[PDB]
Amino acid sequence: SMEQVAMELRLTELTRLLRSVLDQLQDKDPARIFAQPVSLKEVPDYLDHIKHPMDFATMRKRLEAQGYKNLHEFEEDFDLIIDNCMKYNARDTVFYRAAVRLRDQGGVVLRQARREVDSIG
């Protein structure tokens, strides 16, 4: 139908906007601490601690399959990256500190994304 097509155009455009959001968030991680899944070869107990691992590469795969229906779903995945790290790693570690800085800097990007998503509909 024409409606299914219109709906599909909306999703494609959301995917375009979220791709730009993701790029902007990933720039706030210049050390690439959150770029890839935590390695289960290198951290074999990880899934005993963290039940829903997340990272930027994994978000990107979902995004490119148009697997984010709305901004809420995308933010959920971003918050997992941060929250997983702040639980697994102690406060005095470069990893925890990286997550805090990503959270703080990402807030600004995500604030305007929400306005854009509501605005453009």
Side-chain angles (χ1 to χ4, degrees), residues 1-2 4-6 8 11-15 17-40 42-60 62-68 70-110 112-119 121:
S1 68
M2 215 15 260
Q4 289 304 318
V5 168
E8 293 161 359
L11 181 56
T12 296
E13 284 307 305
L14 177 63
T15 301
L17 180 161
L18 299 179
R19 185 182 304 111
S20 169
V21 175
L22 186 65
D23 291 341
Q24 285 179 74
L25 296 172
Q26 191 153 24
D27 286 337
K28 307 313 184 162
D29 173 31
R32 298 194 68 87
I33 288 160
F34 302 105
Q36 290 294 330
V38 170
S39 168
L40 304 178
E42 303 173 357
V43 188
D45 74 354
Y46 189 66
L47 301 184
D48 295 346
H49 291 270
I50 297 302
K51 297 296 176 191
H52 298 99
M54 193 45 56
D55 66 274
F56 289 127
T58 302
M59 289 189 66
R60 200 169 291 278
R62 181 164 168 195
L63 179 67
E64 288 315 334
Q66 301 187 344
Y68 294 115
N70 52 55
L71 183 55
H72 184 75
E73 289 186 343
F74 180 96
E75 292 171 309
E76 282 200 331
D77 273 354
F78 179 64
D79 287 337
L80 274 177
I81 293 179
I82 299 310
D83 290 340
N84 290 342
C85 186
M86 292 176 72
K87 294 167 184 79
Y88 190 79
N89 305 103
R91 218 158 27 250
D92 74 331
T93 63
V94 62
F95 306 107
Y96 186 115
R97 289 166 174 284
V100 165
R101 291 165 62 80
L102 176 59
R103 192 199 55 189
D104 288 351
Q105 298 193 275
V108 181
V109 171
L110 289 166
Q112 204 56 38
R114 158 57 60 208
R115 292 192 67 81
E116 287 179 316
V117 169
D118 292 0
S119 186

